[PDB]
Amino acid sequence: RIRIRLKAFDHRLIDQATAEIVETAKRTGAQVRGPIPLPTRKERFTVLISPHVNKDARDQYEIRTHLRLVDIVEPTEKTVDALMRLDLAAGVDVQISL
Amino acid sequence: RRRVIGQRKILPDPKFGSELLAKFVNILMVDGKKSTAESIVYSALETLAQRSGKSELEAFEVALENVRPTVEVKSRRVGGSTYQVPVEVRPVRRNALAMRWIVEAARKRGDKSMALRLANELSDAAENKGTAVKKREDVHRMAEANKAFA
Amino acid sequence: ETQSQDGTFDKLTKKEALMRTRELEKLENSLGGIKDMGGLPDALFVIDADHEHIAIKEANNLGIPVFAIVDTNSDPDGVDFVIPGNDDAIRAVTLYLGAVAATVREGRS
Amino acid sequence: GQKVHPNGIRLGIVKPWNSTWFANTKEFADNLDSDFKVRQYLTKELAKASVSRIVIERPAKSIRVTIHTARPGIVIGKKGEDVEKLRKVVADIAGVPAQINIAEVRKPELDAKLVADSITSQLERRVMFRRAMKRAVQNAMRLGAKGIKVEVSGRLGGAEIARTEWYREGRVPLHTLRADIDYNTSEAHTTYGVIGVKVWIFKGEI
Amino acid sequence: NQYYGTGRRKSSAARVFIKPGNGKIVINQRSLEQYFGRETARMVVRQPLELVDMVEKLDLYITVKGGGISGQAGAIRHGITRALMEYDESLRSELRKAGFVTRDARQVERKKVGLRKARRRPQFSKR
RNA sequence: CGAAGAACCUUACCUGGUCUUGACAUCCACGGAAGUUUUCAGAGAUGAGAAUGUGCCUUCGGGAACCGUGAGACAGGUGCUGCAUGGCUGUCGUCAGCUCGUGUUGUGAAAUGUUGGGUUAAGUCCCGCAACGAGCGCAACCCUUAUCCUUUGUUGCCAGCGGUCCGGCCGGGAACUCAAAGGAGACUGCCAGUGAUAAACUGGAGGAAGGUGGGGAUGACGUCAAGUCAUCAUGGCCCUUACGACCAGGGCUACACACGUGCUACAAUGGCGCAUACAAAGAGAAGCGACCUCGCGAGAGCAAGCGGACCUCAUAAAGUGCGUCGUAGUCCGGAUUGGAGUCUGCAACUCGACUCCAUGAAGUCGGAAUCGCUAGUAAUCGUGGAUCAGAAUGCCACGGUG
């Protein structure tokens, strides 16, 4: 069964990008075991604000990497060949590995 | 206002396939329950068999003949007051209009049920009866009957 | 102008070029014959003193001498160098007009 | 009121989010919260730092935070002063290893925020609004850019009748999404009232 | 062999497979008369078919599932008419004349804030 | 209409009891761990007592969080001005309008531009023209819906082949529906006729889609001293052993009428029984709640699944098949009331939602007058959500038929 992964930087895109699959990639052919959230990979960073001196400055940033699994649980042909018909999203890593 | 396009092509009867009968069922239709309309008129339309005994098809048109006006009024905000200048009626509405009188007056008939309360009216149409036929002259008594302004 | 000059004319939709080319029609017409003027002239020679009314006006307001070939119904009070001649006549115009450039041609020796 | 936010309206295209990260209803609630505390504070101790924006990346329990400023050095500290302080202040405030990378603002005369925080500060300095509003902001037109619409709220100068001002150069077609504009606000609580200001810098088209 | 024809209208999904022969019609393991037959006017599905002499002509194996009667019936009509065009790409004019080749872009409507039903504005007898 | 949700609370209002550095902030003095169980007096607010309790900085002065109480600067005000204001909103109006620089014109206010001729949804465009250019607008960028392509294939799909504990259930298959990131496509681009051989119009071809594709979003200069000091902020004015603050109960659901906006009817284009087919967009750890068991039923007991294309709320209504009842106030329509019950929550008299039984009114389509609606529209039929412990015919939203 082909497994699909979606890792965006927020739900503003990871949402539609995923619902698309469940809607399109999942009609009757594909089985789809279900859309899961999975733990988010939080990576923050601390940067010295002031240019030179003032150690007590610093500023904290962070980039939440939102992910989703779902994955189709049915390797057919009529429905498993209607996903490629989706490559939009200006930022939604879709690692379609098996 | 100034818009100028065409008419709304209606879907023909569920059997005989006829626009003339199409908008007929619609004018008769109610609450978008188009289904009932069909099962209410399509029956009385054929129940004419018991009322006659043959290919009941032209009976409809013949019945509308006694309900087809050809002159109506039309008040106009002119001459300070309000005119009335009566004018005839193109075919597009002749057939339509009639259908209203045939139904909008077949409801107040107060008979067994709308299904039949309608049937009888058709027989009364060609045989002149009910407000349906009345409305004709009761309307003609204005136009062609008051050409003084026409 | 330079647009059509080189391949810089085959830019944008074929329609666009058309919308831009129209500007030339107007521009190259209403100015196409004055573009080479990098500053007010030193003398203005106008044909009919009537039609080119406004033209002469601005002139006497900038100090640019005016040599106009007025006419009977013309108002020569605006011309500092009147040339009482037929403001019309296909031949009158040509002869003198061409005759002007004549002296001007070798004017600078 | 009768104008859409010239920034949020474009948050989709030609305009990045000053805080990009993922989160679920669970922490999302307190997440955007901390971001406020940290962001609000980073200004308190870095007002005169001439800071523009303040992005906030968040991978996993480690926010980045980028303090864009026209004056980087001052936001740096004595070879560790500022940085250390802030980078440490982000302690319990987020309860996570929060970093901090400063970003140098190129041409502090084309950035809305600054051009806004500045004019307002000048006002607080007992200065004629018209002068600064016009000239002290007109600069955004000399270092480049094509169009800049400024706006000063009411109560300007000795007067009880609040009045708004215009003054704009070039072109600021805020009715074009593909236009991209640098809009930002800025207050100025003076002896009376709170004379506001809005900077609309049209940085090129698409 | 076979000739496929998508076809759809008003949130509908038609899937008709035209085979050479067998005027039998089935829609989701059901009869065109046992699923639609005796409805409002489901005579549209077999409309394009008879429109050019069917029954003893070809076969119709459909698989629709979207929208109510009217629509679900309109989708098929679109798929079928679309399908026949495959068996013969020289009959488009005919089907287009009736208006089957085209789809009913006329979809539903979206409600709107301020209003009460996308268009029906609230009354205010007193203004 | 602020109220996307008034039993307490909310609350701001009334009555009564009660508290005056005070419920909410800091500073000081001296004390006292915070904390938990607690007894009595009371409607409660509270007060009068019994314990249980000693964490640490320990430089053994002092301390920090917090508690007591004393004094005062004050704290507190949903109190007054929206003709003191900021911020925010409605409206003319998605209307096509509103201006500026320079130049020119009149002694000047001012004009011109921006008017005129065609034209467009439009100060849109094309000519003209003492004006030449420019800005805010309109258009276009944004979303969304309408076709196809690339790509990935779980919970989604099943065209083929195969195995069926017949259900895509199981191998398997990336085709197809779909999902959702990125792309192509529409521009008067092409054809013809009108128009001055211009703008544009009228048809037409090609397409899945025409002449800003459909709908959103986007609201110029300003007007109404328009609205909001009651969300918030705030000038000035006010009150302060009290227009501050706590509790209890009551009120905002009163009536002896009226006016506006709605829902459900008045019925056989219907009700009623049985049977049964089709959709979309959505919510959900003090949550949504299965199956199963009980009860006539609301619901209760037990207890899985899903923190989500996996599960649940949710197993659409119109509809279609049959049959019935036959135009009576009915087999219509349900208001009212009585009888008795459930679930929320201290608690539902006042004042809640719902279930069952019985009661079964007005109403037989509505003057004068008036409103919305130009296409998936009006019309009608259901579905979901915000607020929320639990009071929806309101609001926001979705799709069916049309």
Short mmCIF file of N, CA and C in Angstrom, two decimals, chain D residues 72-152:
data_model
loop_
_atom_site.label_atom_id
_atom_site.label_comp_id
_atom_site.label_asym_id
_atom_site.label_seq_id
_atom_site.Cartn_x
_atom_site.Cartn_y
_atom_site.Cartn_z
N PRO D 72 21.85 47.45 13.31
CA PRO D 72 22.23 46.12 13.79
C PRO D 72 23.20 46.15 14.96
N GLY D 73 24.30 46.88 14.79
CA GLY D 73 25.30 46.98 15.84
C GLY D 73 24.72 47.24 17.22
N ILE D 74 23.83 48.22 17.32
CA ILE D 74 23.22 48.56 18.60
C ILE D 74 22.35 47.42 19.13
N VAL D 75 21.84 46.59 18.23
CA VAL D 75 21.01 45.46 18.61
C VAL D 75 21.90 44.24 18.87
N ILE D 76 23.20 44.42 18.64
CA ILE D 76 24.17 43.35 18.85
C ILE D 76 24.68 43.35 20.28
N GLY D 77 25.12 44.51 20.75
CA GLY D 77 25.64 44.61 22.10
C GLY D 77 27.15 44.61 22.12
N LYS D 78 27.74 44.84 23.30
CA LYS D 78 29.19 44.86 23.43
C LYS D 78 29.80 43.50 23.12
N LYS D 79 29.74 43.12 21.85
CA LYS D 79 30.29 41.85 21.39
C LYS D 79 29.63 40.67 22.09
N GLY D 80 28.36 40.85 22.46
CA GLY D 80 27.63 39.79 23.14
C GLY D 80 26.59 40.31 24.11
N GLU D 81 26.64 41.61 24.39
CA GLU D 81 25.70 42.25 25.31
C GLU D 81 24.25 41.97 24.95
N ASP D 82 23.72 42.75 24.01
CA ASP D 82 22.33 42.60 23.58
C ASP D 82 21.94 41.15 23.31
N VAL D 83 22.59 40.54 22.32
CA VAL D 83 22.30 39.16 21.94
C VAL D 83 22.07 38.25 23.14
N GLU D 84 23.09 38.10 23.98
CA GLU D 84 23.01 37.25 25.16
C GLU D 84 21.74 37.52 25.96
N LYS D 85 21.54 38.78 26.33
CA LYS D 85 20.37 39.18 27.10
C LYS D 85 19.07 38.66 26.49
N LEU D 86 18.77 39.10 25.27
CA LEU D 86 17.57 38.67 24.58
C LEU D 86 17.52 37.15 24.47
N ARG D 87 18.50 36.60 23.77
CA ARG D 87 18.60 35.16 23.56
C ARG D 87 18.39 34.36 24.84
N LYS D 88 18.60 35.00 25.99
CA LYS D 88 18.41 34.34 27.28
C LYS D 88 17.03 34.68 27.82
N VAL D 89 16.60 35.92 27.59
CA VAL D 89 15.29 36.38 28.04
C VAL D 89 14.17 35.50 27.49
N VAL D 90 14.42 34.88 26.34
CA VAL D 90 13.43 34.01 25.71
C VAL D 90 13.34 32.69 26.47
N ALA D 91 13.77 32.70 27.72
CA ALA D 91 13.74 31.51 28.56
C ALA D 91 12.32 31.01 28.80
N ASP D 92 11.88 31.08 30.06
CA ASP D 92 10.54 30.64 30.43
C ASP D 92 9.45 31.29 29.58
N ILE D 93 9.78 32.42 28.97
CA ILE D 93 8.82 33.13 28.13
C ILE D 93 8.24 32.18 27.09
N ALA D 94 9.03 31.18 26.71
CA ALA D 94 8.61 30.19 25.73
C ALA D 94 8.98 28.79 26.23
N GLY D 95 9.71 28.75 27.34
CA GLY D 95 10.12 27.49 27.92
C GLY D 95 10.82 26.56 26.94
N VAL D 96 11.49 27.14 25.95
CA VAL D 96 12.20 26.35 24.95
C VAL D 96 13.47 27.06 24.48
N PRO D 97 14.45 26.29 23.96
CA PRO D 97 15.70 26.86 23.47
C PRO D 97 15.46 27.80 22.29
N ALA D 98 15.22 29.07 22.60
CA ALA D 98 14.95 30.07 21.58
C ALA D 98 16.21 30.82 21.16
N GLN D 99 16.47 30.82 19.85
CA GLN D 99 17.63 31.50 19.30
C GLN D 99 17.26 32.94 18.95
N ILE D 100 18.06 33.56 18.09
CA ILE D 100 17.81 34.94 17.68
C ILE D 100 18.85 35.39 16.65
N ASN D 101 18.40 35.61 15.42
CA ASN D 101 19.29 36.05 14.35
C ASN D 101 18.85 37.43 13.89
N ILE D 102 19.78 38.39 13.92
CA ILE D 102 19.46 39.75 13.51
C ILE D 102 19.58 39.90 12.00
N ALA D 103 18.74 40.77 11.43
CA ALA D 103 18.75 41.03 10.00
C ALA D 103 18.95 42.52 9.76
N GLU D 104 19.91 42.86 8.91
CA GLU D 104 20.20 44.26 8.61
C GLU D 104 19.20 44.84 7.62
N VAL D 105 18.62 45.98 7.97
CA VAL D 105 17.65 46.65 7.12
C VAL D 105 18.34 47.55 6.10
N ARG D 106 18.19 47.23 4.82
CA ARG D 106 18.81 48.02 3.77
C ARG D 106 17.94 49.24 3.47
N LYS D 107 18.55 50.42 3.50
CA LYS D 107 17.83 51.66 3.25
C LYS D 107 16.65 51.81 4.21
N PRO D 108 16.92 52.30 5.43
CA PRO D 108 15.88 52.49 6.45
C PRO D 108 14.88 53.59 6.12
N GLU D 109 14.92 54.09 4.88
CA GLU D 109 14.00 55.14 4.46
C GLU D 109 12.89 54.60 3.56
N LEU D 110 12.96 53.31 3.24
CA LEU D 110 11.95 52.70 2.39
C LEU D 110 11.09 51.71 3.18
N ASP D 111 11.51 51.43 4.41
CA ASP D 111 10.76 50.51 5.27
C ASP D 111 9.67 51.28 5.99
N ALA D 112 8.43 50.81 5.87
CA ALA D 112 7.29 51.45 6.50
C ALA D 112 7.53 51.70 7.99
N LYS D 113 7.50 50.63 8.77
CA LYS D 113 7.71 50.68 10.22
C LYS D 113 8.58 51.87 10.65
N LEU D 114 9.85 51.84 10.25
CA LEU D 114 10.79 52.90 10.60
C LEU D 114 10.27 54.29 10.24
N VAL D 115 9.99 54.49 8.95
CA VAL D 115 9.49 55.77 8.47
C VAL D 115 8.27 56.23 9.26
N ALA D 116 7.65 55.29 9.97
CA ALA D 116 6.47 55.60 10.77
C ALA D 116 6.86 55.91 12.22
N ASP D 117 7.64 55.01 12.82
CA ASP D 117 8.08 55.19 14.20
C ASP D 117 8.91 56.47 14.31
N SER D 118 9.56 56.84 13.22
CA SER D 118 10.40 58.03 13.18
C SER D 118 9.57 59.32 13.24
N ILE D 119 8.74 59.54 12.23
CA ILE D 119 7.90 60.73 12.16
C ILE D 119 7.17 60.96 13.48
N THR D 120 6.63 59.88 14.05
CA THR D 120 5.92 59.97 15.32
C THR D 120 6.83 60.43 16.44
N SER D 121 8.06 59.93 16.44
CA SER D 121 9.03 60.30 17.47
C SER D 121 9.42 61.77 17.32
N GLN D 122 9.48 62.25 16.08
CA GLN D 122 9.83 63.64 15.83
C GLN D 122 8.71 64.52 16.36
N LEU D 123 7.47 64.07 16.18
CA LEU D 123 6.31 64.81 16.65
C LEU D 123 6.43 65.01 18.16
N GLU D 124 6.80 63.94 18.85
CA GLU D 124 6.97 63.96 20.29
C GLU D 124 8.12 64.89 20.67
N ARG D 125 8.92 65.26 19.68
CA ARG D 125 10.06 66.14 19.89
C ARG D 125 9.68 67.61 19.69
N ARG D 126 8.38 67.89 19.72
CA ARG D 126 7.89 69.26 19.53
C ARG D 126 8.24 69.77 18.13
N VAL D 127 7.84 69.03 17.10
CA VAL D 127 8.13 69.44 15.73
C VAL D 127 6.88 69.55 14.87
N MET D 128 6.90 70.52 13.96
CA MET D 128 5.78 70.75 13.05
C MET D 128 5.52 69.49 12.23
N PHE D 129 4.32 68.95 12.34
CA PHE D 129 3.96 67.74 11.61
C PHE D 129 4.23 67.86 10.11
N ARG D 130 3.69 68.90 9.49
CA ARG D 130 3.86 69.12 8.06
C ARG D 130 5.31 68.99 7.58
N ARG D 131 6.24 69.64 8.28
CA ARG D 131 7.65 69.59 7.91
C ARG D 131 8.18 68.16 7.80
N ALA D 132 8.20 67.46 8.93
CA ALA D 132 8.69 66.09 8.97
C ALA D 132 7.87 65.17 8.08
N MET D 133 6.56 65.18 8.27
CA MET D 133 5.65 64.36 7.48
C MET D 133 6.00 64.40 6.00
N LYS D 134 6.31 65.60 5.52
CA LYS D 134 6.65 65.81 4.12
C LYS D 134 8.11 65.51 3.83
N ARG D 135 9.00 66.38 4.29
CA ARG D 135 10.44 66.23 4.08
C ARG D 135 11.06 65.02 4.77
N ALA D 136 10.99 64.99 6.10
CA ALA D 136 11.56 63.90 6.88
C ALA D 136 11.02 62.53 6.49
N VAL D 137 10.18 62.49 5.46
CA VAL D 137 9.60 61.25 4.98
C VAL D 137 9.76 61.21 3.46
N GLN D 138 9.97 62.39 2.88
CA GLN D 138 10.15 62.55 1.44
C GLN D 138 11.36 61.75 0.96
N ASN D 139 12.29 61.50 1.87
CA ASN D 139 13.51 60.76 1.57
C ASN D 139 13.24 59.43 0.87
N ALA D 140 12.21 58.72 1.31
CA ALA D 140 11.86 57.43 0.72
C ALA D 140 11.77 57.51 -0.80
N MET D 141 11.70 58.73 -1.32
CA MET D 141 11.61 58.95 -2.75
C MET D 141 12.97 59.21 -3.38
N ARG D 142 13.95 59.58 -2.56
CA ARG D 142 15.29 59.86 -3.06
C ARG D 142 16.18 58.61 -3.12
N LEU D 143 15.97 57.67 -2.21
CA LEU D 143 16.76 56.44 -2.21
C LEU D 143 16.14 55.43 -3.16
N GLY D 144 15.17 55.88 -3.94
CA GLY D 144 14.50 55.01 -4.89
C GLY D 144 13.00 54.96 -4.68
N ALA D 145 12.42 53.78 -4.83
CA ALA D 145 10.98 53.58 -4.66
C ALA D 145 10.16 54.42 -5.63
N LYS D 146 8.91 54.00 -5.86
CA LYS D 146 8.02 54.72 -6.77
C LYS D 146 6.66 54.96 -6.12
N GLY D 147 6.58 55.98 -5.28
CA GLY D 147 5.32 56.29 -4.62
C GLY D 147 5.32 55.99 -3.14
N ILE D 148 4.87 56.95 -2.34
CA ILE D 148 4.81 56.80 -0.90
C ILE D 148 3.72 57.69 -0.30
N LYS D 149 2.66 57.07 0.20
CA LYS D 149 1.56 57.81 0.80
C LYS D 149 1.64 57.81 2.32
N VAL D 150 1.75 59.00 2.89
CA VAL D 150 1.84 59.16 4.34
C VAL D 150 0.47 59.59 4.85
N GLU D 151 0.28 59.58 6.17
CA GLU D 151 -1.00 59.98 6.74
C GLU D 151 -0.88 60.25 8.24
N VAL D 152 -1.20 61.47 8.63
CA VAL D 152 -1.14 61.88 10.03
C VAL D 152 -2.55 62.12 10.57
#
